[PDB]
Amino acid sequence: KVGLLVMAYGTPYKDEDIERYYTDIRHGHKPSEEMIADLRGRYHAIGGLSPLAKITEAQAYGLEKALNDSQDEVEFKAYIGLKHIEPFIEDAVEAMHKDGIEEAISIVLAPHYSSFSVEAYNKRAKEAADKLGGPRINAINDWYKQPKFIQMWADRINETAKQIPADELLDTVLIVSAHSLPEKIKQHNDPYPNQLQETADFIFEKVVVPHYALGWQSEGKTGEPWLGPDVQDLTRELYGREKYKHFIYTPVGFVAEHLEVLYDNDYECKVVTDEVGAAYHRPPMPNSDPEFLEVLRTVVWEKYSNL
Ligand SMILES: CC1=C(CCC(=O)O)c2cc3nc(cc4[nH]c(cc5[nH]c(cc1n2)c(C)c5CCC(=O)O)c(CCC(=O)O)c4C)C(CCC(=O)O)=C3C
Ligand SMILES: [Fe+2]
Ligand SMILES: [Mg+2]
């Protein structure tokens, strides 16, 4: 049996979890009352709580099922390890150890690598395994280059574009985004920004949308520059420069419908298109669609074959 360590950010299970969840996100530094209320307000705006918890489970166990049905070389056992709420990464690794799992494959539910994201996932998983003495953790760093992943997104964009009048397709633009990070990672050649540009390039060559731009979103409450431009600011510039009639947002850095999509895209971005008078489009996120499980199954299996 090979452990499948599936890792993701995590989301509060109950409204009462928001406080400790934000504290964990802030590296154990309690947010102010005013920050807590702002974040609580955003959750209420998207309906109360994020569906990320159930989607993540569906992805993790959909992947496990997908792998075990497609071959009989090994039995995969999925453990869920969350970054900022239980079950934590270290909990999942502990669960594998007590279960006797000797070798595991880990994957992050975000297709691009960065020092701030996947690297932190792998560091904590590998350090937990070290302390316990097992299991051996073979980390997958990124998988945006998976052809089925690029094609999944192209199909979703093409499905939306084919409902845009032909005489307005030329005024349609594809906005490809991911979670922003401190700009300083670009000073040491972090692959994150360039992996995102590669993703947008690969998708653009497979869609009927004639225009596209790369943006970032959800930058944090800090004092340093973050990767820009922000998807809101980019929408304004693009409309002012080209008067686009349709904006299609694909935050390909994310794999599920959660706060950073339901609010930062479906509210904040729609507010900008509403303002300039253009139409807002946001294709469904991967979630646990069969096509996406197939993407993850292909990635994990290729990683196992290379082991
Ligand atoms: C790179 C990256 C991803 C993508 C890769 C991955 O998936 O790992 C990601 C995902 C997510 N980030 C999420 C939520 C939040 N992230 C925050 C804050 C931050 N994220 C950061 C980084 C990332 N985050 C950073 C550097 C900060 C600043 C911390 C600080 O200020 O020191 C804050 C604080 C409040 C605010 O700043 O708005 C919240 C609430 C949720 C869950 C949404 C839900 O609950 O549905 C998801 C999926
Ligand atoms: Fe975050
Ligand atoms: Mg904001």
Numbering used by the authors: 4 to 310
Paper text:
Coproporphyrin ferrochelatase (CpfC) in the CPD heme biosynthesis pathway incorporates ferrous iron into coproporphyrin III (cpIII) to give coproheme, which is eventually decarboxylated to yield heme b by the coproheme decarboxylase enzyme in the final step of this biosynthetic process (Dailey et al., 2017; Dailey & Gerdes, 2015; Layer, 2021). Understanding structure–function relationships of key enzymes, such as ferrochelatase, is an essential precondition for the design of new inhibitors for antibiotic‐resistant pathogens, like Listeria monocytogenes. LmCpfC crystals in complex with cpIII were soaked with a ferrous iron solution and flash‐vitrified after 2, 3, and 4 min, to obtain snapshots of the enzymatic reaction during iron insertion into the porphyrin macrocycle. We report three crystal structures showing different iron content during metalation in LmCpfC, identifying the presence and defining the extent of the porphyrin distortions during iron insertion.
In the “34% Fe” structure (resolution 2.15 Å) best statistics were obtained with a 34% iron occupancy fitted into the electron density, which is located slightly toward pyrrole ring C and D and now in plane with the substrate. Ring A with the substituent p2 exhibits the highest distortion in the “34% Fe” structure (+12.6°), +9.2° in the cpIII structure and lowered values for the “24% Fe” (+4.8°), and the “68% Fe” (+1.9°) structures; in ring B (p4) the angle is altered the most in the analyzed samples (−13.4°, −10.5°, −11.4°, and −6.7°) as a function of the site occupancy by Fe ions, exhibiting a high degree of distortion compared to the coproheme structure. Since its activation is an indication of a saddling (B2u) deformation, these data suggest the formation of a stable intermediate species, consisting of a distorted porphyrin macrocycle in equilibrium with the substrate (cpIII) and the product (coproheme). These data agree with the observed structures representing fractions of iron in cpIII of "24% Fe", "34% Fe", and "68% Fe", where the structure between 0.3 and 0.4 eq of the metal shows the largest porphyrin distortion. The metalation mechanism includes a porphyrin saddling distortion, which becomes predominant both in the crystal and in solution at iron to cpIII ratios between 0.3 and 0.4. The measured change of angles throughout the ferrous iron insertion process at the site of p7 at pyrrole ring D is also peculiar: the rings in the substrate‐ and product‐bound states overlap well for all structures besides the “24% Fe” structure (−2.1° in the cpIII‐structure, −1.6° in the "68% Fe" structure, and −1.4° in the "34% Fe" structure). The residue points toward p7 in the “24% Fe”, “34% Fe”, and in the coproheme‐complex structures, but points away (5.4 Å) in the “68% Fe” structure.
